[PDB]
Design a protein around this ligand. Structure first.
Ligand SMILES: NC(=O)c1ccc[n+]([C@@H]2O[C@H](COP(=O)([O-])OP(=O)(O)OC[C@H]3O[C@@H](n4cnc5c(N)ncnc54)[C@H](OP(=O)(O)O)[C@@H]3O)[C@@H](O)[C@H]2O)c1
Ligand SMILES: Cc1nc(C)c(Cc2nc3c(F)c(F)cc(F)c3s2)cc1CC(=O)O
Length: 315
């Protein structure tokens, strides 16, 4: 099946297009091509600085009669500098305005950490520490719930939450909406077995981000492992007459995850969608899972002292 059922009765496409690091000058075409070749889920965020240009593409394809709004599944995320209850609606509305939409299909708390409100996405003190805000997970969640009640978003969820942070929300007496999704880094070097088991057992759908290992992440080092160039994964791909990227995208799909590979390269956008015509074997799945090294690429040292930093916990 190409979609997975969420807790609001809506269906979410299991394959979406990522947009982090898709430059504004290049992302409109990426999204147009993606829609043309069958993508219906686009993963966005205010912090990606390109929601206007994503919105332009969506608008263009709506006007061309290529898709209708109901067929699209548009995700965005509340940035860390907007966790204060009084800032959440405006942040969501800014995203809606930029995307030229009147609702989101899913809106996520981007990270559990609140940062000092202000213009800078990563406010630092003079010694390089992120400056936190006096906000907490439960109050931010309550503000997210209001967005559903007001019709701005159809579902809400979380991202980069560890299991204890998810538990905090789940256990709130007076909870109005359970998180529908937890979006987390997941690939063969960070397989997330425990957090995936936890979320799936709690009826929360997991989305795998950086499924190709985010080789374009701005802090990558030459000595860092590289999934796309891993000769072992290349061998699995060759056996299936597929590319390594296609294997890396199919992998989470077979774990009942949603997956959101990013590209701005039209050939790759098309390639990455051609993952519904083959199956990884039981041995392939076992082999890929065996490559786990707990090698997390997506974190930021300057955030490690934040009270709500998610990655001190085992999972
Ligand atoms: N919630 C969060 O905190 C969070 C964090 C990270 C990511 N995400 C989401 O997840 C998405 C995906 O993760 P990501 O952007 O970190 O990285 P990714 O999808 O793992 O990798 C993207 C990189 O792979 C390249 N690529 C794509 N398809 C390829 C192919 N078929 N062959 C070879 N190279 C290929 C891209 O190049 P080109 O684009 O130049 O083609 C880009 O450099 C993000 O864009 C974002 O939407 C969310
Ligand atoms: C845009 C962006 N910038 C940075 C620097 C990171 C790494 C990050 N690591 C962390 C982290 F450990 C925290 F506790 C809190 C954070 F906000 C970040 S952001 C990821 C992304 C992509 C995205 O967020 O979707």
């Amino acid at each position: 099946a190409s979609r997975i059922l969420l807790n609001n009765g809506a269906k979410m496409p299991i394959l979406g297009l990522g947009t982090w690091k898709s430059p504004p000058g290049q992302v409109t075409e990426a999204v147009k091509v993606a829609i043309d070749v069958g993508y219906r889920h686009i993963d966005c965020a205010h912090v990606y600085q390109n929601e206007n240009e994503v919105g332009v593409a969506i608008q263009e394809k709506l006007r061309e009669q290529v898709v209708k709004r109901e067929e699209l599944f548009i995700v965005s995320k509340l940035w860390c500098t907007y966790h204060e209850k009084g800032l959440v609606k405006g942040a969501c509305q800014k995203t809606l305005s930029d995307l030229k939409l009147d609702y989101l299909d899913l809106y996520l708390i981007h990270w559990p950490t609140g940062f000092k409100p202000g213009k800078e996405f990563f406010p630092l003190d003079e010694s390089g520490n992120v400056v936190p805000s006096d906000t907490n997970i439960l109050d931010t969640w309550a503000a997210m719930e209001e967005l559903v009640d007001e019709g701005l978003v159809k579902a809400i969820g979380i991202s980069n939450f560890n299991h204890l942070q998810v538990e905090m929300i789940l256990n709130k007496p007076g909870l109005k909406y359970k998180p529908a999704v937890n979006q987390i880094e997941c690939h063969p070097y960070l397989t997330q077995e425990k957090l995936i088991q936890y979320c799936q057992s709690k009826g929360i759908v997991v989305t795998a981000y950086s499924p190709l290992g985010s080789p374009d992440r701005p802090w990558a080092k030459p000595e860092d492992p590289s999934l796309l160039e891993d000769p072992r994964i290349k061998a699995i791909a060759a056996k299936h007459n597929k590319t390594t990227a296609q294997v890396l995208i199919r992998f989470p799909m077979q774990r009942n995850l949603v997956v959101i590979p990013k590209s701005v390269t039209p050939e790759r956008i098309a390639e990455n969608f051609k993952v519904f015509d083959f199956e990884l074997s039981s041995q392939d799945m076992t082999t890929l899972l065996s490559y786990n090294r707990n090698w997390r690429v997506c974190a930021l040292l300057s955030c490690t002292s934040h009270k709500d930093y998610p990655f001190h916990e085992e999972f």
